[PDB]
Design a protein around this ligand. Structure first.
Ligand code: GNP
Ligand code: MG
Length: 167
């Protein structure tokens, strides 16, 4: 097809859950075991083919440390979609993700599409967040949920493409 669409996506979540790794995997097909914590935010773009349409993603990978919380609106204000990321081995990160979802539902665009990534799924031998519990939470809050692994690539392209399909 000759149709081209572009949209703004923001990633939010507690520090160390794998936001930068998820974007690097999607955009560059890379994964770095030693990824440094992000300062403020990083910007990346990727263009994909979505059933007859060329979709360009403008992605804001926010720094998740609490000291950067006040900067979040600068990145989500004009976003058409968000991926709130947690680490399946860390329940506190899952609780933090729920608070990011609440903030988006109250302060971002009322039409924003929100996805929830249960990342580091390759570490299921240390799971702390039950898949079904997270799925139920996502269903009750109208969030597009998938467990992902930036390390193995599991569901990485899938979650970004599913979001694009719903915009
Ligand atoms: N096993 C595993 N490790 C992962 C996965 N995603 C990220 N990691 C690791 O987790 C650590 C933190 O990842 P990173 O992408 O920097 O996290 P972040 O959410 O961007 N942190 P910040 O918000 O501070 O910038 C890194 O050592 C990275 O390699 C994953 O899916 N599986
Ligand atoms: Mg980061």
């Amino acid at each position: 097809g000759n149709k081209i669409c572009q949209f703004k996506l923001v990633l939010l979540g507690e520090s160390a859950v794998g936001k930068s790794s998820l974007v690097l995997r999607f955009v560059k097909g890379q994964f770095h075991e030693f990824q440094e914590s992000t300062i403020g935010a990083a910007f990346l773009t990727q263009t994909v083919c979505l059933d007859d349409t060329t979709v360009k993603f403008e992605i804001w990978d926010t720094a998740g440390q609490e000291r950067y919380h006040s900067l979040a609106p600068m990145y989500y204000r004009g976003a058409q979609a968000a991926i709130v990321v947690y680490d399946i081995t860390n329940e506190e990160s899952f609780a933090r993700a729920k608070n990011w979802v609440k903030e988006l539902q109250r302060q971002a665009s009322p039409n924003i599409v929100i996805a929830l990534s249960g990342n580091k799924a390759d570490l299921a031998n240390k799971r702390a967040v039950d898949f079904q519990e997270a799925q139920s939470y996502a269903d009750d809050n109208s969030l597009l949920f998938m467990e992902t692994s930036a390390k193995t690539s599991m569901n990485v392209n899938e979650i970004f493409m599913a979001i694009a399909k719903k915009l």
